[PDB]
Structures are given as C-alpha cells and as structure tokens.
Amino acid sequence: SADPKFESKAALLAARGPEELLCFTERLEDLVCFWEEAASAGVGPGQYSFSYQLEDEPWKLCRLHQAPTARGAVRFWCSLPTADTSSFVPLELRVTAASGAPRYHRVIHINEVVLLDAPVGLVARLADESGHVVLRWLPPPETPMTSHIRYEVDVSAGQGAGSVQRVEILEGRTECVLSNLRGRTRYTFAVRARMAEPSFGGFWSAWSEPVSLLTPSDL
Amino acid sequence: SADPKFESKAALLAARGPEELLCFTERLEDLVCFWEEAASAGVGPGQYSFSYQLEDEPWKLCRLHQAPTARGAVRFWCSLPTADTSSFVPLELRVTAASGAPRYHRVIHINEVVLLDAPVGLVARLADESGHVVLRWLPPPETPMTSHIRYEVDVSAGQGAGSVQRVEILEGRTECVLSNLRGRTRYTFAVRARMAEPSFGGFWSAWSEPVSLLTPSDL
Amino acid sequence: SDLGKKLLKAARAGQDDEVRILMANGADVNATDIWDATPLHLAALIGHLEIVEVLLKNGADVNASDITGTTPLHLAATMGHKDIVKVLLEYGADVNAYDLNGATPLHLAARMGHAKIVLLLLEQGADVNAQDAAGMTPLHLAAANGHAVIVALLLMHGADVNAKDAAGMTPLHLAAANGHEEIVILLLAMGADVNAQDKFGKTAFDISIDNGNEELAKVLQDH
Amino acid sequence: SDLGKKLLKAARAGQDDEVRILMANGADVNATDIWDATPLHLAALIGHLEIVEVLLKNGADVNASDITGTTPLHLAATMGHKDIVKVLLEYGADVNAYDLNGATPLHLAARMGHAKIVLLLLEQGADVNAQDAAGMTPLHLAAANGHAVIVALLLMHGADVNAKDAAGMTPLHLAAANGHEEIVILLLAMGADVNAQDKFGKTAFDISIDNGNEELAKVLQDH
C-alpha cells in the first residue's frame, strides 16, 4: 500500500522545506498534501483534522494517512478526491490538532504546485568542431504538455564540491551546449524539469540520472 | 599536463578542509601537498616558497605548480621527489610568502595521509530468505594491501535528504547486510575505503559508484 | 449582508480589483468564515501587500483571532511575509498575541527560520522569553532547529539561555539532542549550564551520549 | 650543545619519553632550527599536550616568535588545538601577538572557523577589533568565511560591525561578496551601514548585484 513514486517526490520536497505543509500535483487532476513531524507518543492520523474548501463548496474533511519516513519521523498525508481538485481556483487548506490548536493553514492553486518526474535520457558529448560539451535529454515521462517545460542543468566537478554551474534552459529546449569548461577535467551533469510560468507553476523535479565526461585538453 | 586522477582526489579533499594545506599519498612512495586560494593579481607560483625537511636531511625547496580550479580559484601544489618520501618519519612542511610572511606550516607522516581510490563493483541484492539487502563490492583498484582496508557504506533515501545511515565495515570485509530498511522504499548505497589504524592512516576515499534498490513490501 | 462572503473569497484569491469593488459597495471588512478568519487573515496568508493595506486602511481588526487563536501577524510571521509583518505591526498588531499552542509570532518566526522577521518582531517589542504550551521560549525552538543566526538574535535581545520547558529542558539540551554543536558553543558562550538536567535527570552531556554525539559530549565536558 | 637539535626533532616527533631524556640531560628547551622555531612551536603544531606542558614547565619561551612572526599560540589557534591554546595562555602567552601578516591568534582562529577557540581567546582578553596587514578585523574574516557563530561571538564582544579594511570594505561588503545572507542579517541587526561604500565606490548592495545575488540585494534595499 506504499506508493514508491509518491514517496520519492514526497521526500524530495520534504528535504527542501522542512516543517511545512507540502502540496503537489503530478497530472493536474490529483493533489496530495503532506507534512512530516517527529514520532510523538500515540499520536496518530486521528489526532489531526484536514479541512479543505474551494470555490463555493462547503468545507470538506480529508482522511489523513500516516507512515514512518526512511529517517524515522512520521508523514501524514491527504490525497484529495479527484472530483474536488479543480485547477485555477484558490484552494484553502487547514490542519487543526484534535484539541482545536492550529497546525497548518495554506492557500494554494493546484496549477501552481506541479511536480514533474525527472528528465530522462541524459547524454553528454564533445562537439567535433569545438571542445564544447553538448548535453541532450528527453522530457520527463508522461508529462501532458512538453512545450511548457523549462529545464535547468547542473554542472559539478568532483565530490562534495557540487553545483559548479547551473544553466537555465529556454522553454522546450531539450539541449544544452557548454563552452567554458576547463580542459582535462572530469565534469558531471544532471538536469531538472519544471512547469513554465505564468500558465502553470510548481517545483523543480528531482535531478535526472547524472552523466560524467572528461573534457579534452588544451582548454 | 593535467592529471585527472590527482585533480579528482585534490578537489575531494579541498571541499572537506578549505583554506588548509592538504597532503596525501596514493601508493606511499609519492606525496602531494596542495592548497587553494582565490586568484589574486599577478601572484603566481613564484610568490610562495615550499620548504620541507625530514630526518637529518637539510631543508629542501619544492617547486610549486599552479592551475585554476573548476570553481575559479588557483591551486598550488608540490609533488615531493620520490627519493625524499620516506614513511614512518616526521615530515615538516612550510609555505612562506615571497615577502617572508607565514602561509602554512604542518608536520605530517606520509603513512598517515593515504587517500585510496574509491571502491568498485558495488552490487546490492535482496537475500532470498529475509528481505535483507546484501551489499558487496571490490577493494579499491591497485591498493597495496587490501587486508588493512576498512570500509564505510552510506544508506540514503531520496534526493537532498542523504546519509540516512552510515555503516562501519570491519577490516577486509567486502560485504554488508542491511536488516532494518523500511519496506517498499527505494534506497541507494555507496561505499568508501580508507587505510586501517594504527599501522597506517589517511582519509576516506571518494564514494563508490552508487547502487539503488527497491526494498520488498511487508517491512 | 451577502457581500461579506464575497470579500473573503476575493481577498484569498488576491483579486485586487474585486476587493476594491466589494469594499466600496459596503461589504464588511471584518466578515468571517466558518473559522472566524477575516479577510485580513487570508490577505496576510496570501502575501498580498496591496490588499492588506486596503483592508487595514478600511479598519479591519488587526488583532482578529480565528477559532485557533491565529492572528494575521501569526500567519505573516509563519509564511515569512516580512513586508506584511511590517504593515500589521504598523497598525498596532499585538506583537505578543498567542495562539492555542501558546506560540507568539516570535515562536513561529523562530521555528520556521525567518531571521529577518525574528529581528523585526524583536525590534517591535516582542517578548523574547515568551513561553508556549510546552513552556518553550523562541530560543528553545531556534536551538532545536539549528538556526544559529536566530539563536544569536534572540540571545542579544535578552533571551534566557537557561530557560526550561515543561520537561525542564534548556536550549542546551535541545541543541545537544539535534547535534547543533555550533549552537551548543554559542549557548555556552552566553552562560549555558552544562550541569543542568531535565525532569528525567539527564544533562546536555547525557543527551549527547544517548544520541551518540560523543563529539559534542567532549565539548560540554571540557567547559 | 648538540642536544638542542635532538630536542627539536623529538618534540615534533611527539616522542614523550625521548623529550624527557633530553630535558634531563641538559638540552636547551629554547633551541631553534633554521626558522627560529622552538620545540614549543613544534609541540603545539603537533598537538602533544603532554610535551607542551613539559616544555612550559621547564621555561620554554611561551612567546617565542619564528622568523615569520608565528608564535606557538598562532599555531595552536590555527590547527584548532583548544587544549594547547589553554595551556599557552595559562603561561602568559601574548593573546594579541601578531605575525608578519598582522594576524593575531583571533584572526587565525576566526578564519579557520574554530568557534571554541575564538571564544577562549576572547575570554583571555583578545583584541576583538585587531587589524591585520589588510586592515581586516577577525569579524572581516569571519563574515567572509560564513562562520555565523564566530560572527555572533565577535559581535557580542564589542566588534566594530562597520570596520573598514584597506579597501574600505566593511564585513557587510565581505558577507555580501560571498552570499552569506544569514550573516548579512546578523550584521544588520548590530548596526551595519547599508549605505557604506568602499574606496572603489560600491556598497553592500552594489557588490551583491555585481555578484548576481539579487536575493541578498533586496534584503539590504528594504532596511
């Protein structure tokens, strides 16, 4: 009953914004909200109440699930019914403790919390004419509209000293050519994907599988 | 004239101890000392003097080389003549600016600054009887004595939230079995190598190539 | 008085123009939803500085509290909206208002790590040693969460370095429980008590060895 | 007086027993090598607390300076040997001794990030606003190197937040040049001057936009 694809994305966002209520959608028809907190006594999913309201519908309750995280905390989450997820309208979320105490309160737009899969098929090659490295990849799998995806490639060199360079990629460009890399140097490359403003919005995807390359000499 | 294997190890240590004089040996007959600093004016290798003395020999000068790093700083380094590198004796290092001002001063033992290659051949499998993950790997390539190598495996889960667990491995054990991993969870594993006390000493190697695995359910 | 519902939905939609239309049409600036949340709550939660200014300039209750004890200053301090925090305090927002968890805006800003807002709230007379339901001061939260900057900010504004919560745990305990050795040193430099144990009878040294952080334990053992 | 060479080589070899033998045989405790480095220099550089105590108890010059201006306190403060720093100061080591770069032990400890030693040196009366050859105080080094804890430690011991170096650059400049926004806020909370430019005529805001850190630039622009 454990969803590996969701729990991958969930731990990704959790590490970015700890102690926050984190919501995202993969295909714009779903919506999952979750948070993580230290395991405390016998506090279960019945000790919090997840309220949500959108448009003119009444405030509705969403049943919360819980499961321990790979680190040992507990993760509560609510998967909103696909019937209620409607994009481009404000959606008010409230988490209140069973005592009535405040826990979380957020307003989101489902079309602004897209979290794509990572890009796939990364390849790096040296241009034949110049020593430039050409990166190419494929759009994230099963993304509705690839024209409105913008990428970001990471150039790192050696372990522990990452992010030597980050390169913003124009919308719908599945290619990147790097022309300032120092020669005879082993570089490594990965690339993220995210939905492009202002029609949509969201979070950077997890990094693609990386690709390493040894630049030529005389550079 | 750029050594990729040395520059890989060099950037590894540099990210661990910035602004430090960093010395290491790969095969116990060599010794390289280096440091990194922001590019400053026309300051070249002639603006520092690298002095070293060991046992009863006179103080000797080592010619310094320089090269920009992948991040943009400059790295000065000295590769001591193999004739002078003798283990198990104190070796005094001094870097003095051309003005006579102090820059670095260290005392090392070559047999205490070994920096091995990373382990290779990592494999992860689920034990047939129990859901335990069995990691196996091969000793770092071209290491003199594999009996005195001790390893450390990293268990991580999801991006940005690394080092869920670190496992110390007994000397000469090329195997590790993990029995507390949560089920239906995609874990990733890597392993370091280093020389074992007290005969030798040094620094953890760069992490091996990683291996990911999806644990079975019901755990 | 149907317009009050439309103002709450417009404010949280960030609709600048529709809010001004409903304002001028006589809508209640202090309308409440099923939570007793006013449009100023939703405006502050959204981050709409323009709408917060309009609602405040039209007499919205700055210290409106919903049924959770949350005020707009609580929401702006949590979400990190420094600009909105300034305007709420500009209009006399109670800097030391507490929600049903006993947490003041300085608690929330410190837990979340908003260093700029922790400063601004302090500069507006926030109680540094305010205690929540667990008896924890903002320094407790900052020390547990590893926010060294906020820890230093609280310390230089008169924070009790040896404040004990309901468990009798000082910030030195919480810093040791999460391996924030850098904060352990900063607390020690301000007079933290190494020889101070909780109700359970364990000091900062005892928690580090129970957590396995003997590196941090030798730090407390020296001085 | 051949033994003086053997003591220098034994001290840096950490040979406890051989040092005691040479001591008792009348060897000079203040012997010097080609650098005018005493055995106390090498003992402090090694980390041998036992040998530093023996040499000090036998009258080694605590404030011995080699031809680079480096004293044993400079070496222990750089290498981070907190235990040896305490014993040197115990024996009256000049806390404000400066090397040929103008750097005091508080400069070196702050550059390297030894928070515990920065505290201990301050507690022993270190000059907080001491200037090196570049005119940089330890706060300059700490602000550039991102050590927020050391920055707070220096600040609470009377550090000039607006101290200018030879380039006229305050810690606010150096913190902005390396993207240490958290330190930028901590400096601002202690009265840093946003409207302060260097000899080149660029303020903390001007360096952030030249570095591309417009996120940090909007921080200085608000207040």
Cis status of the peptide bond prior to B141, with omega within 30 of 0: no
Amino acid at D30: N
CB contact residues (below 8 A), chain C span 124-153, against chain D: 148-149, 152-153
| Chain C residues within 8 A of D82 when measuring between CB atoms | 222
Q: How many CB atoms within 10 Å of residue D35?
A: 19
Give Cβ neighbours of residue D72 (< 8 Å, ≥ 6 apart).
Answer: D38, D40, D41, D43, D44, D45, D52, D62, D64, D84, D88, D93
Residue found by looking up tokens 């650059």 in the block: D169
Distances (CA, A) of A139 to A146, A149, A213, B62: 7, 8, 21, 52
What is the Cα C211 distance to its own chain's centre?
A: 28
| Chain gaps in chain B, named by the residue before each (C–N > 2.5 Å) | none
Query: Which residues from chain B sit within 8 angstroms of residue D105, using beta carbons?
Result: none
How many whole angstroms separate alpha carbon C198 and alpha carbon B166?
Answer: 30
What amino acid occupies position C153? L
SS3 content of chain D, % helix, strand, coil (to 5): 50, 0, 50
List Cβ neighbours of C185 (8 Å cut-off, separation of 6 or more). C219, D115, D116, D119, D149
D67/B contact by beta carbon, under 8 A: yes
Task: Give the distance from residue C161's alpha carbon to the nearest chain D alpha carbon, in angstroms.
Answer: 15
Q: Cβ distance A145 to A171 under 8 Å?
A: no
Answer whether B99 sits within 8 Å of D100, measured CB to CB.
yes
With 0-12 CB in 10 A as exposed, 13-18 as middle and 19+ as buried, what is A5?
Answer: exposed
Residue A129 CB contacts under 8 Å (≥ 6 apart), including other chains: none
Which is it for the CA torsion A98, A100, A101, A106, positive or negative? positive
Written in H, E and C, the secondary structure of B8-30 is: HHHHHHHHHCCCCCEEEECCCCC
Task: Please provide residue D74's backbone torsions phi and psi, each rounded to the nearest 5 degrees.
Answer: -60, -40
User: What was the elucidation method?
Assistant: X-ray
Q: Are A150 and A167 in contact (CB under 8 A)?
A: no
State both tokens at C34.
Answer: 């099923």
CA dist B113 and A190 (Å) reads: 33
What would the DSSP string read from start to end of C125-157?
Answer: T--TT---TT---HHHHHHHTT-HHHHHHHHTT
CB of A104 closer than 8 Å to CB of A93: yes
Q: HEC profile for D127-179?
A: CCCCCCCCCCCHHHHHHHCCCHHHHHHHHCCCCCCCCCCCCCCCHHHHHHHCC
Indicate yes or no: CB of B105 within 8 angstroms of CB of D46: no
Q: Two tokens at A183?
A: 């020669």
The DSSP bridge pattern shows strands A48-54 and A91-97 to be antiparallel
Residue D1 CA to residue D83 CA, distance in Å, equals 32
- Give the sign of the dihedral formed by CA B166, CA B171, CA B176, CA B179: negative
Which residue among B19, B59, B100 places its CB closest to the CB of D34? B59
Taking the C-alpha atoms of residue D193 and residue D203, their distance in angstroms, rounded to an integer, is: 9
How does strand B211-214 pair with strand B175-178? unpaired
Residue bearing tokens 């105080």? D137
Its sign, for the CA torsion D180, D185, D187, D192, is positive
DSSP reduced 3-state for A189:
strand
Helix (H) or strand (E) holding D12: helix D3-12
Q: Are B36 and A218 in contact, with CB atoms under 8 Å apart?
A: no
Q: Is the dihedral of CA B118, B123, B126, B127 positive or negative?
A: negative
Are C63 and A123 in contact, with CB atoms under 8 Å apart?
no
3+ Cβ–Cβ pairs closer than 8 Å linking A and D: no
> What gap in Å lies between CA A59 and CA A63, rounded to an integer?
13
- For residue D164 the two structure tokens come to 């200018």
How many CB atoms within 10 Å of residue A129?
6
How far is it, in rounded angstroms, from Cα C82 to Cα D119? 33
Radius of gyration of chain A (CA): 21
Minimum Cα–Cα distance from C111: chain A residue: A19
Contact check, Cβ <8 Å, D148/C148: yes
In angstroms, the separation between the Cα of residue C160 and the nearest Cα of chain A is 25
Q: In terms of DSSP bridges, do strands B48-54 and B60-62 run parallel, antiparallel, or are they unpaired? A: antiparallel
Listed in sequence order, the residues at least 6 apart from D170 whose beta carbon sits closer than 8 Å to its beta carbon are D161, D162, D163, D164, D192, D193, D196, D204
CA angle in degrees (0–180, nearest 5) for B16-B22-B27: 105
| Structure token pair of residue A124 | 């790096």
Q: Which runs of consecutive H residues, i.e. helices, occur in chain C?
A: 3-12, 16-24, 39-46, 49-57, 72-79, 82-90, 105-112, 115-123, 138-144, 148-155, 171-177, 181-188, 204-211, 214-222
The CA-based dihedral angle spanning residues A84, A90, A96, A101, taken in that order and rounded to the nearest 10 degrees: -160
The DSSP secondary structure of D104-121, one letter per residue, reads -HHHHHHHHT-HHHHHHH
Vertex C34: Cα angle to C30 and C35 (nearest 5): 75
Kindly report the backbone phi and psi dihedral angles of residue B92, in degrees, each rounded to the nearest multiple of 5, phi listed first.
-95, 130
Calculate how close chain B gets to A36, using CA atoms only, in Å: 13
- The secondary structure of D22-34 as a DSSP string is HHHTT--TT---T
Angle between helices C115-123 and D181-188 (to 10 degrees): 10
Chains touching A (at least 3 CB pairs under 8 A) are: B, C
**CA–CA separation, B113 vs B168, rounded Å?**
20
Instruction: Return d(Cα D222, Cα D50) in angstroms, integer.
Output: 55
Which amino acid does the sequence have at D158?
G
Q: Would you state the structure tokens that stand for residue C20, as one six-digit string?
A: 């001004």
Best probe of the B interface among D7, D9, D99, D111, by most B CBs < 10 A, is: D9
Q: Long-range contacts of range B41-49, CB-CB < 8 Å, 24 or more positions apart? A: B45/B76, B46/B98, B47/B97, B47/B98, B48/B76, B48/B95, B48/B96, B48/B97, B48/B98, B48/B103, B49/B95, B49/B96, B49/B97, B49/B98
For the CA atoms of chain B, what is the radius of gyration? 21
All structural domains of chain B, each given as residue ranges with its CATH number in brackets, are 19-113 (2.60.40.10), 114-219 (2.60.40.10)
Rounded CA-CA distance B177/A169 in Å is 42
Q: Do C186 and D219 touch (CB under 8 A)?
A: no
Q: Reply yes or no: is the peptide bond before residue A198 cis, omega within 30 of 0.
A: yes
Among D110, D115, D180, D185, smallest CA distance to D140 is for D110
Calpha distance D84→D90 (Å, rounded) = 10
A43: amino acid identity, one letter: V
B18, burial (CB in 10 Å: exposed 0-12, middle 13-18, buried 19+): middle
D: neighbours with 3+ CB pairs under 8 Å? B, C
Give me B158's structure tokens.
Answer: 């999801």
Q: The tokens 């400063």 sit on which residue?
A: C119
Cβ neighbours of C91 (radius 10 Å): 19
SS3 C202: coil
Q: Which residues pair with A114 in a beta bridge?
A: A25, A202
Q: CA separation (Å) from D32 to B111, D24, D27, D28, D61?
A: 27, 18, 12, 9, 11
CA distance C189 to C197: 19
Best CA proximity match to D186, nearest among C108, C152, C80, C128: C152
A chain contacts of residue C47, beta-carbon cutoff 8 Å:
none
